[PDB]
Design a protein around this ligand. Structure first.
Ligand SMILES: CC(C)c1ncc(Cl)c(C(N)=O)n1
Length: 165
């Protein structure tokens, strides 16, 4: 199962890892994507996960949006995990760089409670512009299911662990 994680709480674990490499290694039931409402996987975690699927994630996502329309900020959808996981849970955290409401981060993390165990990034972190320390706090205070967080940046991982209350 998941290896090398630091246990933060009863159900939240964290590791300095590339979520793509982690997903290819574990092949978890659920990998979370840091999605946008359009499922346009251009950069950050979404661009990296999509590139690992040879764009199959984007082709599937475009068919999903053509049928259903965009997701809501704070919402999610379950699609295939392709070569990375059984499923991909595409979760839309607020993008602070697009002037979106940071209060929607708790709603975004609530999507994780529909899955017993997940491999995930910190929502709204990175190119989404939120403070990753705040994202980890919301994660631990919202998610009740088993969440294995992959933090790509070593310096951020160390800052997250050393400042964890
Ligand atoms: C009825 C189908 C199209 C549906 N409705 C809503 C969602 Cl959120 C999902 C999903 N892929 O998780 N699928």
């Amino acid at each position: 199962s998941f290896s090398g994680y630091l246990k933060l709480t009863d159900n939240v674990y964290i590791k300095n890892a590339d979520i793509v490499e982690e997903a290819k290694k574990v092949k978890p039931t659920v990998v979370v994507n840091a999605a946008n409402v359009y499922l346009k996987h251009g950069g950050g975690v979404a661009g990296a996960l999509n590139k690992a699927t040879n764009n199959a994630m984007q082709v599937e996502s475009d068919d999903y949006i053509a049928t259903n329309g965009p997701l809501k900020v704070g919402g999610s959808c379950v699609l295939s995990g392709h070569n990375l996981a059984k499923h991909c849970l595409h979760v839309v955290g607020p993008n602070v760089n697009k002037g979106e409401d940071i209060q929607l981060l708790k709603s975004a993390y609530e999507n994780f409670n529909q899955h017993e165990v997940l491999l995930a990034p910190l929502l709204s972190a990175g190119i989404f512009g939120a403070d990753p320390i705040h994202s980890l706090r919301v994660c631990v205070d919202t998610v009740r299911t088993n969440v294995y967080l992959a933090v790509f940046d070593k310096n951020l991982y160390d800052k997250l662990v050393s400042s964890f209350l």
